[PDB]
């Protein structure tokens, strides 16, 4: 909910902002349309249909603008943290190409293709998610990372 968004620390909002920035790369009016959602999806190795992408945009577009702005992105995230389990597993697998149950530094570099976010940002992301210091994020770490401890 809108209010719950204000429970996020200032650092969480910034991190979500960094993620939002990747989606709006080269976007009109800096908001996420089906076009940008399709580009990230494709960069992650998927091949969504127009119906699937439109379904995702409508699910989080609260003002019927047809696009997702940062405020709506935040609410969307707050909502998933506080079905979500399944999307999380798929997302993990999108990064875990060899299916060994880990996301290593190289696999995270997928986010630099056709791209705002930098290698330093990636190595930092890795440190944030890698709790046991083995240079990788396993599924349990990933879930804790995505849900918030
Ligand atoms: C590498 C694969 C294991 C991940 O793809 C799984 C897809 C993702 N979904 C939704 C989704 C998108 C983003 C993040 C998590 C889930 C999907 C839907 C439309 C287009 C591409 C993927 N789900 C489709 C139904 C069950 C599998
Ligand atoms: C997967 C979770 C961490 C966040 O859940 C949001 C995703 C799609 N997101 C994020 C996303 C999209 C593609 C690839 C990775 C993550 C989303 C993003 C932008 C616009 C709309 C939805 N689904 C929410 C319900 C249906 C959509
Ligand atoms: C799931 C999406 C809404 C984006 O989530 C963004 C980041 C890291 N993502 C990076 C990412 C960028 C763009 C699209 C999808 C994901 C991430 C990626 C891989 C492994 C761990 C985190 N999470 C860190 C803690 C909560 C936010
Ligand atoms: Ca909107
Ligand atoms: Ca892997
Ligand atoms: Ca680890």
Swiss-Prot record:
The molecular function terms in GO held by this entry are: calcium ion binding; calcium-dependent protein binding; troponin I binding
SMART domains from the UniProt entry: EFh
Residues the record lists as binding Ca(2+) 3: 130, 132, 134, 136, 141
Which Gene3D superfamilies does the record cross-reference, listed alphabetically? EF-hand
> Which GO CC annotations does the UniProt entry carry?
cardiac Troponin complex
* CDD domains registered for this protein in UniProt: EFh (cd00051)
Positions of Ca(2+) 1 binding? 61, 63, 65, 67, 72
The record's section on SUPFAM superfamilies has:
EF-hand
Q: Per the UniProt entry, what are the Gene Ontology biological process annotations, in alphabetical order?
A: cardiac muscle contraction; skeletal muscle contraction
For Ca(2+) 2, which residues are the binding ones?
A: 96, 98, 100, 102, 107
Which ranges carry the EF-hand domain?
A: 12-47, 48-82, 83-116, 117-149
Do you know which InterPro entries this protein is assigned to? CALM/Myosin/TropC-like, EF-hand-dom_pair, EF_Hand_1_Ca_BS, EF_hand_dom
The UniProt record lists the keyword Metal-binding: yes
Cite a single Pfam family from the UniProt record: EF-hand_8
Alphabetical UniProt keywords: Acetylation, Calcium, Metal-binding, Muscle protein, Repeat
Give the top-rank taxon of the lineage listed in the UniProt record for this protein.
Eukaryota
Q: What else is known?
A: Slow skeletal muscle Tn-C can bind 3 calcium ions per molecule. Domain I does not bind calcium.
Q: What does this protein do?
A: Troponin is the central regulatory protein of striated muscle contraction. Tn consists of three components: Tn-I which is the inhibitor of actomyosin ATPase, Tn-T which contains the binding site for tropomyosin and Tn-C. The binding of calcium to Tn-C abolishes the inhibitory action of Tn on actin filaments.
**Which family is annotated?**
Belongs to the troponin C family.
Protein name per the record: Troponin C, slow skeletal and cardiac muscles
| Organism for this UniProt entry | Gallus gallus
Q: Could you tell me the gene encoding this protein?
A: TNNC1
């Amino acid at each position: 909910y809108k209010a719950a968004v204000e429970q996020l620390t200032e650092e969480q909002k910034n991190e979500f902002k960094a993620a939002f920035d990747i989606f709006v790369l080269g976007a009109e009016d800096g908001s996420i349309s089906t076009k940008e959602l399709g580009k990230v999806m494709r960069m992650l190795g998927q091949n969504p249909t127009p119906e699937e992408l439109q379904e995702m945009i409508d699910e989080v577009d609260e003002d019927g603008s047809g696009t997702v702005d940062f405020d709506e992105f935040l609410v969307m995230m707050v909502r998933s943290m506080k079905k979500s389990e399944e999307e999380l597993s798929d997302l993990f697998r999108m990064f875990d190409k060899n299916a060994d149950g880990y996301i290593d530094l190289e696999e995270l570099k997928i986010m630099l293709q056709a791209t705002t976010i930098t290698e330093d940002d990636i190595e930092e992301l890795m440190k944030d998610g890698d709790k046991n210091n083995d240079g990788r994020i396993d599924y349990d770490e990933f879930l804790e990372f995505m849900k918030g401890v």
